[PDB]
């Protein structure tokens, strides 16, 4: 009944999260750069479909997650999935100003977002977020904490204590990493706030991206996997 998650030390939490990390996947090995709605949306939905499978098995390895009922696990993943793909994308792209690293063999700039109708806006938001993370010098250890926070937080009010204690535990872990990195107390709480405010922006982008995927579903630009359709359908 008591969750192992709360009994973990900060270092144990960090190592558990680092070890749960999914791998960076590749897209198709074609030399052409996507300049059509169809090709680009095909590559992106294909990539999302594969990353989703990894995300599902990552989530089970986030301390405290498997202590939830299956229905609550379903709800959290349904609410958070696009936010999680997006933060992953933004993180990957950090060392590439102006570009989104969808995959090591698929690095896109805004001029290709200009192609797909209604996409460049989301593209630009993602780029701004990436730039923000770069300027804050976000660390990998901080990144994985933020990602788990998204997983546990996004659908938590729509339930809706265990999750709240786990969320507190992750906050303790972020502060721990910041102290360990040598920040003063003032820098610690200021940095914590800065990172969490960005989560609001990521939620905004997910909402916009969900709209976009919906119009894409209705325009039938490209077939979507049943998994991707169900994750979309969850947001009704």
């Amino acid at each position: 009944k008591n969750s192992l998650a709360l009994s973990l030390t900060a270092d144990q939490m960090v190592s558990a999260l680092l070890d749960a990390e999914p791998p960076i996947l590749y897209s198709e090995y074609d030399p052409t750069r996507p300049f059509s709605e169809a090709s680009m949306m095909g590559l992106l939905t294909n990539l999302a479909d594969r990353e989703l499978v990894h995300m599902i098995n990552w989530a089970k390895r986030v301390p405290g997650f498997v202590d939830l009922t299956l229905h609550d696990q379903v709800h959290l993943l349904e609410c958070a999935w696009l936010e999680i793909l997006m933060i992953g994308l933004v993180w990957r792209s950090m060392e590439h100003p102006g570009k989104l690293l969808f995959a090591p063999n698929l690095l896109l700039d805004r001029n290709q977002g200009k192609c797909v109708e209604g996409m460049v806006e989301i593209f630009d938001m993602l780029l701004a977020t990436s730039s923000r993370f770069r300027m804050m010098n976000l660390q990998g250890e901080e990144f994985v904490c933020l990602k788990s926070i998204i997983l546990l937080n996004s659908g938590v009010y729509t339930f809706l204590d265990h999750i709240h204690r786990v969320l507190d535990k992750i906050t303790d872990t972020l502060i721990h990493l910041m102290a360990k990195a040598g920040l003063t107390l003032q820098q610690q709480h200021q940095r914590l706030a800065q990172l969490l405010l960005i989560l609001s922006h990521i939620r905004h982008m997910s909402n916009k991206g969900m709209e976009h995927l919906y119009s894409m579903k209705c325009k039938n630009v490209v077939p979507l996997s049943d998994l991707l359709l169900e994750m979309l359908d969850a947001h009704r």
Binding site: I56, A59, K60, V74, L77, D226, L227, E230, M231
Partner: peptide, 9 residues
């Protein structure tokens, strides 16, 4: 749901 199944795998 497919998600239901994959969470169980």
């Amino acid at each position: 749901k497919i998600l239901h199944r994959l969470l169980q795998e």
